[PDB]
Amino acid sequence: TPQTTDAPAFPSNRSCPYQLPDGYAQLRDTPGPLHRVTLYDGRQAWVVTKHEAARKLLGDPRLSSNRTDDNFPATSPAFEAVRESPQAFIGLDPPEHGTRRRMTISEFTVKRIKGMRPEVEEVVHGFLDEMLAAGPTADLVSQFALPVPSMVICRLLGVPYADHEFFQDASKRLVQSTDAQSALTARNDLAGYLDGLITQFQTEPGAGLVGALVADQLANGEIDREELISTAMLLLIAGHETTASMTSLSVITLLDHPEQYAALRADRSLVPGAVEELLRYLAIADIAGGRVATADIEVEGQLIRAGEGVIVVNSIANRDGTVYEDPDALDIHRSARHHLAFGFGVHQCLGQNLARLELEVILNALMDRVPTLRLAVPVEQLVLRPGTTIQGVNELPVTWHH
Ligand code: HEM
Ligand SMILES: CC(=O)N1CCN(c2ccc(OC[C@H]3CO[C@](Cn4ccnc4)(c4ccc(Cl)cc4Cl)O3)cc2)CC1
């Protein structure tokens, strides 16, 4: 008897870095803002698959971000690590979301990001210096894509880059965790490290966001010590793991579209617009779209009930053809405005403009310093991370004219 279902398994895994999984193309192609899916443990949930309905639902305070709710949609057993408190503000609703978020925004302003450009350029060209001096073949991930945003986010936070071996290993173990025990261990490892850093700042006040939170909000009782740990850990992992994935997938994608990459090198004024298109097209943080309804929500004749899980799948929303004509075509010249790679609304990515800065500087540096850059293995041989985490590749063999 047939196996066809009306609530297919979710998430799906990419088989090409810049292509929707087959099941997601199916969801994109079916009319209506929502579709039922089956999560890993058999629970049904809703996915949002259309662009404006995704903006609307991201804007709806009845869809809560509280990951500790028992009805929050967990997409893998590893969710239990981040299901355990205290949540950073990414998992808070108004008004608590605002009080905590505002403790960090000063580090991510347009003015501050502008002020970081000389640092980002120096760090990028330093790791390129070292990689190009050693000659090919190199893994772009370990040699460049990951160290660059790690060094930058360390100075922003006041986390000593000398500890990068420890905290990068713990972050990777957390990001890649496929069961709760592995994820909790990695999280506990980072948590204890950050607790010791807090104690060091209480002895010796210091620079960086962590040092600022310790000396002010923590000392006034306005943030819990373990809330500070959760917030710093969010920013540290988002600050280097997510951006690193965006670099490697962008390089793969541009090399698979040689005409567009050549147009980009020939006119660097196109880089900001290319960055927006790559963000729309690669949408690497599908995993960040989970919500839980605290009240019934009517959506174009379909009803979300209080207690149901909803996942706003921004990658599928970003392929909405009513917003992006020929949505599966990479076009660095198109209008990629209003894309949802960073979300929308009160939770829109705090790091978005640092990510935009870093990708711009990195793309120009690679075109400047390594114009002969090419992959050292076929694209099909690369290993893509599954849909249960941030999209990316575990390694990226590259070569170039030595
Ligand atoms: C290409 C890189 C990145 C992408 C695609 C991305 C994606 C996202 C998305 C989709 C959200 C919305 C989550 C939701 O609605 O629940 C978000 C939130 C957030 N991101 Fe990013 N992110 C990136 C880089 C960064 C960086 C570099 C940081 C630096 C610390 C960062 C920090 C945050 C924070 C703190 C939030 C929570 C915002 C809030 O709850 O008010 N992200 N991100
Ligand atoms: C639920 C599940 O399957 N898993 C496995 C993947 N996990 C994971 C993945 C990435 C990660 O990096 C930093 C976290 C911080 O926020 C996200 C998304 N993000 C990244 C940058 N800006 C936002 C995120 C990621 C996962 C989930 Cl469920 C929700 C969210 Cl907002 O990454 C930290 C943990 C742990 C939970």
Author numbering: 7 to 408
From the paper:
Ketoconazole and miconazole clearly exhibited competitive inhibition, whereas lanoconazole exhibited noncompetitive inhibition. The Ki (inhibition constant) values for ketoconazole, lanoconazole, and miconazole calculated from their Dixon plots were 22.68 ± 2.33, 0.90 ± 0.10, and 1.20 ± 0.35 μM. Thus, the allowed conformation of ketoconazole for binding to the heme in the binding pocket is highly restricted compared with those of lanoconazole and miconazole. The terminal residues of the F helix and the residues in the F-G loop are positioned differently in the ketoconazole complex compared with the lanoconazole and miconazole complexes due to the phenyl group of ketoconazole being located near Val181 in the F helix. The structural properties of ketoconazole show that the entropic cost of binding to the heme is larger for ketoconazole than for lanoconazole and miconazole. Therefore, ketoconazole showed a lower affinity (larger Kd value) than the other two inhibitors.
In this work, we selected CYP105A1 from Streptomyces griseolus to study the biochemical and structural mechanisms of inhibition. The structures show that the ligand binding pocket is predominantly surrounded by hydrophobic residues, although there are three arginine residues (Arg73, Arg84, and Arg193) in the binding pocket. Our previous studies showed that wild-type and mutant CYP105A1 metabolize 12 types of non-steroidal anti-inflammatory drugs (NSAIDs), including diclofenac, with the R84A mutant exhibiting particularly high activity towards many NSAIDs.
